Amino acid sequence: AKDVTIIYTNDLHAHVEPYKVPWIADGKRDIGGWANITTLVKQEKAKNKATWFFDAGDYFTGPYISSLTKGKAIIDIMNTMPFDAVTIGNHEFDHGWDNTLLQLSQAKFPIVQGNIFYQNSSKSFWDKPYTIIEKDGVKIGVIGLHGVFAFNDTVSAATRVGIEARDEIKWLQRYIDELKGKVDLTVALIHEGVPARQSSMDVRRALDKDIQTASQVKGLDILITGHAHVGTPEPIKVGNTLILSTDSGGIDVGKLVLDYKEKPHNFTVKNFELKTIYADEWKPDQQTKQVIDGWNKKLDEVVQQTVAQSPVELKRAYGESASLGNLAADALLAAAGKNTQLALTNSGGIRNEIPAGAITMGGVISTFPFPNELVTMELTGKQLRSLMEHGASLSNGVLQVSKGLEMKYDSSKPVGQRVITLTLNGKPIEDATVYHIATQSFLADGGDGFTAFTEGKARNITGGYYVYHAVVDYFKAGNTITDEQLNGMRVKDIK
């Protein structure tokens, strides 16, 4: 018998330094930090030779250190961490697939990705579908895959032109088959399912896709999943497969210890822990911290600039309005100008709280990190209601809306029949009426399954002018945070 230890993360989302989470110790205790995670993994690797560290994608995008470097800083920091293999998540595409190739080429650790291809081609996007990593005489085959639904749902259209993910189940079984007689254990790092709830609290999230995947293939030992940000405090067992995940952002790190007795694909679980990382319990790895610090110094000049103030922490919600959604929608509306009647933006695009006090450029970027450009268009009331119904389905959260738009839905009704009321400036939205709206390019191209945006007429896109520019400009124009932004339930579940 040999201890075989697998440590894993997913959806780290550029949370390179320790930070507060409103629902952990009431936002009063720092969690995570990648230098802390480095210390954890280094200590485990020092204790047992047969120890692997894996990540299931979405290390890009969150705190400004990612967006402002197009993920370059993130690869540099990860190069100081002892990863044995990672896969590619949707967020690694956020600055375009050419940037994906460029940045990830700089990784000093293996990256596996076996089901993204050039459209109308058999050519693979990445060059390595799986790899074998041997430690202390034990060989682990590691496969990387992205779910097709998740890829189409969450990769911005503008960043995936000419590439696509293909049937993840077909490829998973193929790679399991190719590895079967070559390895002791087969692990898949799969980025798939429903996107994470983005909330300061609020919409049920689970790992149903991953259970389905495990039930559909034969011979997979371990399935480490990312995308949903739903941790597995105990492994989910499906046949002989164990499904593992974390709560994202380095809030916790999973550790699985197996008893392996030299019979390939046969093992028992010795111990499992999904451990919450409290910064005050860890010594940060000095090399990782040094690389983070160097990047912060480079970016400081730009990010430190004060752009606004708030009397209270600004929050987000996935199933209803919250202050950051109200603000962003009002900012898009202001930027579009007086011919525009309303603005809509997505809850999943709002990635962090903004603290009370002086608001800085860095804070705004961390909350609104995406290169999603301002778009104006004309939609009918029927098209608007369709978008509202898609929001109310909660598959991708509700749309956040500008002042004057009010929507009430009831989540206990069937999907597609949940909207109860929908008014603009007190008047019901009407099917045939044309409305002048503002949004951004992720939604305009049908992101998050909001298909009706693609039917908009009289479309105008402002190149290079992103949500965070709109927010900064809202304050530059002399607007402030209002009480109705802080407290207005413009979108509400009345269940």
Ligand X SMILES: Nc1ccn([C@@H]2O[C@H](CO)[C@@H](O)[C@H]2O)c(=O)n1
Q: Cβ 154 to ligand X, closest distance in Å?
A: 4
Backbone phi and psi for residue 103, each to the nearest 5 degrees, phi listed first: -70, -45
Q: Cβ 10 to Mn ion, closest distance in Å?
A: 8
- Confirm or reject binding of residue 197 to Fe ion (CB under 5 A): no
Distance CA 387, CA 393 (A): 10
| Cβ atoms 417, 394 nearer than 8 A | no
Distance CA 45, CA 103 (A): 27
Q: Cβ 330 to ligand X, closest distance in Å?
A: 17
- Confirm or reject binding of residue 282 to ligand X (CB under 6 A): no
Interaction pattern, residues 33-62, with Mn ion; x per rule: CB under 5 A: -------------------------x----
Nearest to 56 by CA among 91, 106, 97, 95: 91
Which residue among 18, 147, 319, 362 contacts Cl ion (CB under 5 A)? 147
- Which residues ranging from 338 to 377 are in contact with Fe ion (CB under 5 A)? none
Give the three-state DSSP class for 65.
helix
Nearest to 34 by CA among 233, 295, 273: 295
Backbone phi and psi for residue 463, each to the nearest 5 degrees, phi listed first: -60, 135
Residue 44 binding target from Cl ion, Fe ion, Mn ion, none, CB below 5 to 8 Å by type: none
**Count of residues of this chain found to bind Mn ion when the rule CB under 5 A is applied:** 2
Which lies closer to Mn ion via its Cβ, residue 77 or residue 429?
A: 77
Residue 192 binding target from Cl ion, ligand X, Mn ion, none, CB below 5 to 8 Å by type: Cl ion
Report the DSSP beta bridge partners of residue 183.
none
- Confirm or reject binding of residue 396 to ligand X (CB under 6 A): yes
Which lies closer to Cl ion via its Cβ, residue 146 or residue 316?
A: 146
Which residue among 4, 11, 93, 153 contacts Mn ion (CB under 5 A)? 11
Which residue among 37, 75, 145, 150 contacts Cl ion (CB under 5 A)? 150
Which lies closer to Mn ion via its Cβ, residue 58 or residue 164?
A: 58
Which residue among 72, 160, 227, 385 contacts Fe ion (CB under 5 A)? 227
Report the DSSP beta bridge partners of residue 203.
none
Backbone phi and psi for residue 120, each to the nearest 5 degrees, phi listed first: 60, 35
Residue 278 binding target from Cl ion, Fe ion, Mn ion, none, CB below 5 to 8 Å by type: none
Residue 254 binding target from Cl ion, ligand X, Fe ion, none, CB below 5 to 8 Å by type: none
- Which residues ranging from 39 to 98 are in contact with Fe ion (CB under 5 A)? 58, 89-90
Give the three-state DSSP class for 322.
coil
Q: Which two tokens stand for residue 121?
A: 């081609």
Backbone phi and psi for residue 150, each to the nearest 5 degrees, phi listed first: -60, -40
Q: Which two tokens stand for residue 467?
A: 């949500």
Distance CA 462, CA 467 (A): 11
- Confirm or reject binding of residue 94 to ligand X (CB under 6 A): yes
- Which residues ranging from 417 to 476 are in contact with ligand X (CB under 6 A)? 442, 448
| Cβ atoms 1, 267 nearer than 8 A | no
Which lies closer to Fe ion via its Cβ, residue 89 or residue 391?
A: 89
What does the DSSP assignment read for 256-307? EEEEE-SSTT-EEEEEEEEEE-BGGG-PPPHHHHHHHHHHHHHHHHHHT-EE
Which residue among 195, 319, 391, 456 contacts ligand X (CB under 6 A)? 195
Which lies closer to Fe ion via its Cβ, residue 90 or residue 200?
A: 90
Q: Which two tokens stand for residue 244?
A: 């593992």
- Confirm or reject binding of residue 192 to Fe ion (CB under 5 A): no
Q: Cβ 203 to ligand X, closest distance in Å?
A: 12
Residue nearest to Fe ion according to CB distances in the complex: 227
Which lies closer to ligand X via its Cβ, residue 13 or residue 492?
A: 13
Distance CA 221, CA 6 (A): 12
Which lies closer to Cl ion via its Cβ, residue 147 or residue 371?
A: 147
Q: What is the DSSP letter of 368?
A: S
Backbone phi and psi for residue 71, each to the nearest 5 degrees, phi listed first: 85, -5
Give the three-state DSSP class for 420.
strand
Which residue among 92, 94, 192, 406 contacts Cl ion (CB under 5 A)? 192
Q: Cβ 348 to ligand X, closest distance in Å?
A: 2
Residue 71 binding target from Fe ion, Cl ion, ligand X, none, CB below 5 to 8 Å by type: none
Give the CA dihedral 23, 304, 11, 393, nearest 10 degrees.
Answer: 60
Which residue among 370, 409, 466, 475 contacts ligand X (CB under 6 A)? 370
Q: What is the DSSP letter of 319?
A: S
Which residue among 372, 380, 400, 439 contacts ligand X (CB under 6 A)? 372
Q: Cβ 419 to ligand X, closest distance in Å?
A: 20
Report the DSSP beta bridge partners of residue 8.
54, 254
Pairing of strands 306-310, 357-360: antiparallel
Distance CA 178, CA 183 (A): 10
Residue 80 binding target from Fe ion, Cl ion, ligand X, none, CB below 5 to 8 Å by type: none
Chain contacts with ligand X (rule: CB under 6 A): 94, 154, 156, 195-196, 346, 348-349, 370, 372, 396, 442, 448
Contacts with Mn ion, residue ranges (CB under 5 A):
11, 58
Which residues would be at the binding site for Fe ion (CB under 5 A)?
58, 89-90, 227
